[PDB]
Protein backbone atom coordinates (compact mmCIF):
# COMPACT_ATOMS: atom_id res chain seq x y z
CA UNK A 1 0.00 0.00 0.00
CA UNK A 2 3.13 2.17 -0.06
CA UNK A 3 3.98 4.74 -2.73
CA UNK A 4 7.13 4.23 -4.80
CA UNK A 5 8.59 7.10 -2.76
CA UNK A 6 7.69 5.73 0.66
CA UNK A 7 8.90 2.28 -0.37
CA UNK A 8 12.24 3.96 -1.04
CA UNK A 9 11.92 5.74 2.32
CA UNK A 10 11.32 2.38 3.98
CA UNK A 11 14.57 1.11 2.47
CA UNK A 12 16.37 4.15 3.90
CA UNK A 13 14.91 3.27 7.29
CA UNK A 14 16.04 -0.35 6.98
CA UNK A 15 19.56 0.85 6.19
CA UNK A 16 19.67 3.24 9.15
CA UNK A 17 18.71 0.31 11.41
CA UNK A 18 21.37 -2.03 9.99
CA UNK A 19 24.55 -3.15 11.75
CA UNK A 20 26.50 -1.11 9.16
CA UNK A 21 25.61 2.12 10.96
CA UNK A 22 25.11 0.74 14.50
CA UNK A 23 28.18 2.51 15.94
CA UNK A 24 26.45 5.89 15.59
CA UNK A 25 22.80 4.93 15.00
CA UNK A 26 22.10 2.95 18.18
CA UNK A 27 21.11 5.92 20.43
CA UNK A 28 18.23 6.53 17.96
CA UNK A 29 16.96 2.93 17.79
CA UNK A 30 14.43 3.47 20.61
CA UNK A 31 12.87 6.52 22.28
CA UNK A 32 15.29 8.49 24.45
CA UNK A 33 15.15 6.85 27.88
CA UNK A 34 15.07 9.90 30.11
CA UNK A 35 14.39 7.62 33.08
CA UNK A 36 17.46 5.42 32.62
CA UNK A 37 19.63 8.39 31.59
CA UNK A 38 18.30 10.47 34.54
CA UNK A 39 17.44 13.35 32.19
CA UNK A 40 14.75 14.90 34.35
CA UNK A 41 14.32 17.87 31.98
CA UNK A 42 14.34 15.99 28.67
CA UNK A 43 10.56 16.02 28.19
CA UNK A 44 10.41 19.68 29.17
CA UNK A 45 12.89 20.68 26.46
CA UNK A 46 11.83 18.15 23.80
CA UNK A 47 8.09 18.59 23.27
CA UNK A 48 7.88 16.08 20.38
CA UNK A 49 10.25 13.12 20.79
CA UNK A 50 11.09 10.92 17.83
CA UNK A 51 13.22 7.85 17.14
CA UNK A 52 13.71 5.19 14.48
CA UNK A 53 11.47 2.57 16.12
CA UNK A 54 8.69 5.16 16.09
CA UNK A 55 9.34 6.04 12.44
CA UNK A 56 9.24 2.31 11.65
CA UNK A 57 5.90 1.68 13.36
CA UNK A 58 4.38 4.69 11.59
CA UNK A 59 5.73 3.50 8.23
CA UNK A 60 4.52 -0.04 8.90
CA UNK A 61 1.20 1.45 10.00
CA UNK A 62 1.02 3.35 6.69
CA UNK A 63 0.79 6.59 8.66
CA UNK A 64 2.98 8.77 6.42
CA UNK A 65 0.97 10.61 3.73
CA UNK A 66 4.06 11.12 1.53
CA UNK A 67 7.84 10.95 1.58
CA UNK A 68 7.87 14.52 2.93
CA UNK A 69 6.20 13.47 6.18
CA UNK A 70 8.70 10.64 6.60
CA UNK A 71 11.57 13.10 6.18
CA UNK A 72 9.99 15.52 8.66
CA UNK A 73 10.00 12.86 11.38
CA UNK A 74 13.59 11.79 10.68
CA UNK A 75 14.78 15.40 10.84
CA UNK A 76 12.75 15.97 14.00
CA UNK A 77 14.71 13.07 15.53
CA UNK A 78 18.01 14.74 14.62
CA UNK A 79 16.75 18.20 15.62
CA UNK A 80 15.70 17.06 19.09
CA UNK A 81 19.23 15.70 19.60
CA UNK A 82 20.88 18.97 18.54
CA UNK A 83 18.36 20.92 20.63
CA UNK A 84 18.80 19.04 23.89
CA UNK A 85 22.55 18.32 23.94
CA UNK A 86 25.59 20.61 23.97
CA UNK A 87 27.15 20.94 20.50
CA UNK A 88 30.33 19.12 21.57
CA UNK A 89 28.45 16.04 22.83
CA UNK A 90 29.36 12.70 21.29
CA UNK A 91 25.69 11.91 20.60
CA UNK A 92 25.53 15.09 18.49
CA UNK A 93 28.48 13.86 16.43
CA UNK A 94 26.64 10.53 16.06
CA UNK A 95 23.45 12.29 14.95
CA UNK A 96 25.37 14.26 12.29
CA UNK A 97 26.94 11.06 10.95
CA UNK A 98 23.57 9.32 10.72
CA UNK A 99 21.96 12.45 9.26
CA UNK A 100 24.66 12.46 6.56
CA UNK A 101 23.57 8.93 5.69
CA UNK A 102 19.90 9.97 5.64
CA UNK A 103 20.18 13.18 3.62
CA UNK A 104 22.38 11.50 1.00
CA UNK A 105 20.02 8.57 0.42
CA UNK A 106 16.93 10.79 0.59
CA UNK A 107 18.31 13.25 -1.96
CA UNK A 108 19.00 10.39 -4.38
CA UNK A 109 15.38 9.16 -4.27
CA UNK A 110 14.23 8.49 -7.87
CA UNK B 1 23.70 -30.60 11.38
CA UNK B 2 24.21 -28.76 14.67
CA UNK B 3 24.23 -30.37 18.12
CA UNK B 4 21.57 -29.31 20.63
CA UNK B 5 24.38 -27.45 22.40
CA UNK B 6 25.71 -25.62 19.35
CA UNK B 7 22.16 -24.76 18.30
CA UNK B 8 21.86 -23.06 21.69
CA UNK B 9 25.26 -21.43 21.07
CA UNK B 10 23.98 -20.16 17.73
CA UNK B 11 21.06 -18.52 19.54
CA UNK B 12 23.54 -16.84 21.91
CA UNK B 13 25.39 -15.53 18.87
CA UNK B 14 22.17 -14.22 17.32
CA UNK B 15 21.39 -12.38 20.56
CA UNK B 16 24.85 -10.82 20.79
CA UNK B 17 24.36 -9.49 17.23
CA UNK B 18 20.91 -8.03 17.95
CA UNK B 19 20.06 -4.34 18.26
CA UNK B 20 19.37 -4.98 21.96
CA UNK B 21 23.10 -5.07 22.71
CA UNK B 22 24.35 -2.87 19.83
CA UNK B 23 25.46 -0.01 22.12
CA UNK B 24 28.32 -2.14 23.47
CA UNK B 25 28.50 -5.03 20.97
CA UNK B 26 29.15 -3.08 17.75
CA UNK B 27 33.00 -2.91 18.04
CA UNK B 28 32.96 -6.74 17.91
CA UNK B 29 30.64 -7.10 14.89
CA UNK B 30 33.55 -7.22 12.41
CA UNK B 31 37.31 -7.85 12.69
CA UNK B 32 39.22 -5.04 14.38
CA UNK B 33 40.08 -2.58 11.60
CA UNK B 34 43.67 -1.76 12.49
CA UNK B 35 43.98 0.11 9.20
CA UNK B 36 41.06 2.47 9.78
CA UNK B 37 41.90 2.83 13.50
CA UNK B 38 45.62 3.39 12.67
CA UNK B 39 46.63 0.69 15.15
CA UNK B 40 49.95 -0.18 13.56
CA UNK B 41 50.87 -2.60 16.37
CA UNK B 42 47.53 -4.39 16.71
CA UNK B 43 48.54 -7.48 14.73
CA UNK B 44 51.86 -7.65 16.57
CA UNK B 45 50.15 -7.78 19.98
CA UNK B 46 47.08 -9.81 18.95
CA UNK B 47 48.35 -12.99 17.28
CA UNK B 48 44.87 -14.55 16.89
CA UNK B 49 42.15 -11.99 16.16
CA UNK B 50 38.50 -12.90 16.62
CA UNK B 51 35.13 -11.20 16.20
CA UNK B 52 31.44 -12.08 16.01
CA UNK B 53 31.24 -12.15 12.20
CA UNK B 54 34.07 -14.69 12.27
CA UNK B 55 32.33 -16.77 14.95
CA UNK B 56 29.16 -16.66 12.83
CA UNK B 57 30.84 -17.87 9.64
CA UNK B 58 32.51 -20.72 11.54
CA UNK B 59 29.20 -21.69 13.15
CA UNK B 60 27.41 -21.47 9.80
CA UNK B 61 30.27 -23.47 8.30
CA UNK B 62 29.77 -26.12 11.00
CA UNK B 63 33.39 -25.62 12.05
CA UNK B 64 32.92 -25.89 15.83
CA UNK B 65 33.36 -29.47 17.12
CA UNK B 66 31.39 -28.73 20.31
CA UNK B 67 30.02 -25.90 22.42
CA UNK B 68 33.43 -25.67 24.12
CA UNK B 69 35.14 -24.57 20.91
CA UNK B 70 32.47 -21.93 20.35
CA UNK B 71 33.06 -20.56 23.85
CA UNK B 72 36.83 -20.56 23.32
CA UNK B 73 36.48 -18.27 20.29
CA UNK B 74 34.08 -15.90 22.05
CA UNK B 75 36.42 -15.60 25.04
CA UNK B 76 39.39 -15.13 22.71
CA UNK B 77 37.50 -12.15 21.26
CA UNK B 78 37.08 -10.64 24.73
CA UNK B 79 40.63 -11.57 25.76
CA UNK B 80 42.19 -9.85 22.76
CA UNK B 81 40.31 -6.68 23.71
CA UNK B 82 41.53 -6.77 27.32
CA UNK B 83 45.04 -7.63 26.13
CA UNK B 84 45.44 -4.82 23.61
CA UNK B 85 43.68 -1.90 25.33
CA UNK B 86 44.35 -0.09 28.61
CA UNK B 87 42.01 -1.27 31.39
CA UNK B 88 40.24 2.10 31.57
CA UNK B 89 39.36 2.12 27.85
CA UNK B 90 35.70 2.42 26.93
CA UNK B 91 35.94 -0.57 24.58
CA UNK B 92 37.09 -2.67 27.56
CA UNK B 93 33.97 -1.62 29.47
CA UNK B 94 31.93 -2.58 26.39
CA UNK B 95 33.64 -5.98 26.18
CA UNK B 96 32.87 -6.67 29.86
CA UNK B 97 29.20 -5.79 29.34
CA UNK B 98 28.93 -8.09 26.32
CA UNK B 99 30.89 -10.81 28.10
CA UNK B 100 28.40 -10.60 30.98
CA UNK B 101 25.67 -11.30 28.44
CA UNK B 102 27.64 -14.22 26.97
CA UNK B 103 28.70 -15.94 30.20
CA UNK B 104 25.18 -15.72 31.64
CA UNK B 105 23.49 -17.27 28.61
CA UNK B 106 26.25 -19.85 28.15
CA UNK B 107 26.09 -20.97 31.78
CA UNK B 108 22.33 -21.50 31.46
CA UNK B 109 22.71 -23.85 28.48
CA UNK B 110 20.48 -26.93 29.06
Amino acid sequence: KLSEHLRYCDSILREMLSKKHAAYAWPFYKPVDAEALELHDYHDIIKHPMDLSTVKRKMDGREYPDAQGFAADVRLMFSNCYKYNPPDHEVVAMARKLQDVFEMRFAKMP
Amino acid sequence: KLSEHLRYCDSILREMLSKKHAAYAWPFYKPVDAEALELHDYHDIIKHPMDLSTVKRKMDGREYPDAQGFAADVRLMFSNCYKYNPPDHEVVAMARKLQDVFEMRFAKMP
Binding site: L37, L39, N85, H89, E90 | A23
Partner: peptide, 9 residues
Protein backbone atom coordinates in the same frame (compact mmCIF):
# COMPACT_ATOMS: atom_id res chain seq x y z
CA UNK C 1 22.89 16.80 34.18
CA UNK C 2 24.70 15.95 30.92
CA UNK C 3 23.56 12.83 28.99
CA UNK C 4 25.87 9.82 29.52
CA UNK C 5 25.41 7.30 26.72
CA UNK C 6 26.87 4.30 28.58
CA UNK C 7 24.24 4.91 31.30
CA UNK C 8 21.62 3.64 28.84
CA UNK C 9 22.67 0.13 29.84
Amino acid sequence: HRXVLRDNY
